Structure 1
Amino acid sequence: APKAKIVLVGSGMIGGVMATLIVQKNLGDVVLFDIVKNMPHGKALDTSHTNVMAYSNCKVSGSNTYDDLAGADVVIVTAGFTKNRDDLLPLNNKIMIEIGGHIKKNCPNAFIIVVTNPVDVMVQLLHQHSGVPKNKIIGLGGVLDTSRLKYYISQKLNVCPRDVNAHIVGAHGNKMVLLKRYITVGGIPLQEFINNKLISDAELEAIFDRTVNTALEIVNLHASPYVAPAAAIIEMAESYLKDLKKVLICSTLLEGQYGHSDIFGGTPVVLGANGVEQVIELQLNSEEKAKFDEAIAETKRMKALAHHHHH
């Protein structure tokens, strides 16, 4: 096998960090694609020199040509308008449709990661127009949202961040379902730490609200989230590329899980060489299911608005 070819469809801030991390990790050749003239060539050039510092040997190329999708193993889609918000849904639908046609033609066996918000909508639109199998396309959501929850808890408890495990399901956005019952610290139920007064229920509520609102908190601090999104996406991609079979929460086609079909939503999946190798259905109680249902309903509402412009 030659190296993997990884095509970043969108070379904005998240793209730039993704390119950086791919080279750090020597994960494959990178194409920074964008519709903006020359900019992706400039970022690609800058990024390419870091092969020296990293002792890697990944090519990093820019592209303004959709045909450069040919032979892609992994396609990561960040392209889309970001600036009410529902008015962007049909514009972004058109972007998914165009990208999907190019994936179908040029790299129908690629594994596809969708980032364009609202991701649980956009991923399904790209699934439909790209024609790729359901195990070959996913959306970013839970790895990112849970990194925040895990991190905040770990700082309170003074433990390694990765030793906090947590589940956020349903959708990526304001209807995300944070599951207190599925939080552990070093594999131990969070409740034990609450029982010991090491962290309180009230503190946890504050951390939940902070988790849901983190993107807004960052924007209100005159920054914007792109470094953690990039890292989350690269964790997903790497699991696929290296057949690590990590359990990672991602937006995936539901086929009855949680009572839902014909829609994408956030749930733990196992990512390895065959893409989505397993879809894990958490055994939610009725209160948790109700919240899952609200997340799905909101994805459906926005999906309906995505199809069509009106005068």
Structure 2
Amino acid sequence: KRPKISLIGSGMIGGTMAYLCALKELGDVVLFDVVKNMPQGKALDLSHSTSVADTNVKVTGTNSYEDIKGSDVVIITAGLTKVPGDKEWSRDDLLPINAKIMKEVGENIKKYCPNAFVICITNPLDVMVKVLQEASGLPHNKVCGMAGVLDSSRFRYFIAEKLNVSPRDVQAMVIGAHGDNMVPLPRYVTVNGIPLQEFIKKGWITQEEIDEIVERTRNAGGEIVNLLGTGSAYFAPAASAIAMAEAYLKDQKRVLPCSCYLEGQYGVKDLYVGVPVVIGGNGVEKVIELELTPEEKEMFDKSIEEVRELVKALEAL
């Protein structure tokens, strides 16, 4: 039988992700949402598009978790977003309400598709993937969060733009927690293996512009929201998560910064945070421990501790 991909949450990101799954014939799709008839509407739109693409993909809409039975992969966008930010929204609403949805999603995964590879997108990302892992009981290797691939896609793009080379040939990474305490890694940026500093010396780019690109990367999500007025980014967020899903389903063994369960690496135990990892047919297969400078480890430590604060505040109740 085909691979089964279930999208928990059928908003903008969920629909586009399902569009990519249909365009790439990655497998049968299931769009789930609490809103009645809505996932069923997109599914029929998307079903019609398969006709234009000359594919066979089955896309289904549903308001019941039962239809995620046997899913090979599960990708979760459901919950409140950051669009309101009201400075008390993250603390009084985002964190406490989303944690409760993650617990309900995790329980449904546990009963209906406990073998799936599970990719979380809901924010606060690092916190929510932990909660989803706890509630679902699945191996820590098969539950991770999408954040670094998106933050890296922005980083790489901004670099590629100034240098005027294809983004394929810009290697860039962003680690740490997803959010304002993310850590772009300017030292590790290369152009097809060439350190970026070589282009600084040859005048393709300058050091300040690089520092600007670091900050623009950290705020890229808000830059787009502000410009949209209504809504948030969904084209790149959806591709990033489907890159990770394609890496799992085709055992591509790609190297991508993802939010994953550490156990000693980087001096972190029993915690989810963004790090470079190898994604393969068996999920998160290897964590790469980068030889970070002391300064870099400091930014990583301050970012890893904000994640703790919130994991603990959530554990209060």
- Match of 1:11? 10
CA–CA separation in structure 2 for the residues paired with 1:46 and 1:22: 14
Letter in structure 2 aligned against 1:29: D
Match of 1:254 among 251, 256, 262: 262
CA–CA separation in structure 2 for the residues paired with 1:155 and 1:5: 37
CA–CA separation in structure 1 for the residues paired with 2:183 and 2:243: 22
- Match of 1:301? 309
- Match of 1:30? 29
Displacement of 1:168 in angstroms is 0.7
Alignment of 1:94-133 (within 5 A): 94-133=100-139
CA contact (8 A) 1:90 1:308 kept: no
Displacement of 1:308 in angstroms is 5.0
Letter in structure 2 aligned against 1:182: Y
Aligned residues between the structures: 308
Matched, 1:148 2:154: yes
SS of the residue aligned with 2:26?
A: coil
Displacement of 1:283 in angstroms is 1.2
Deviation sequence 1:110-150 (CA, Å, 0-9, x none): 00000000100000000111011011011011100010010
Deviation sequence 1:56-113 (CA, Å, 0-9, x none): 2110000100111210000001101225111121111110111111111111100000
Matched, 1:86 2:91: yes
- Match of 1:235? 243
- Match of 1:158? 164
CA–CA separation in structure 1 for the residues paired with 2:48 and 2:278: 34
Letter in structure 2 aligned against 1:81: L
SS of the residue aligned with 2:228?
A: coil
Match of 2:185 among 175, 179, 183: 179
CA–CA separation in structure 1 for the residues paired with 2:54 and 2:250: 19
Gapped runs of 5+ residues in structure 1?
Answer: none
Letter in structure 2 aligned against 1:87: D
CA–CA separation in structure 2 for the residues paired with 1:269 and 1:52: 37
Structure 1 stretches of 4+ with a deviation exceeding 3 A read none
Residue identity over aligned pairs, in percent, reads: 57
- TM-score scaled by structure 1? 0.97
Deviation sequence 1:23-78 (CA, Å, 0-9, x none): 11000000000011110000111011111222221100001001112100000011
Displacement of 1:166 in angstroms is 1.0
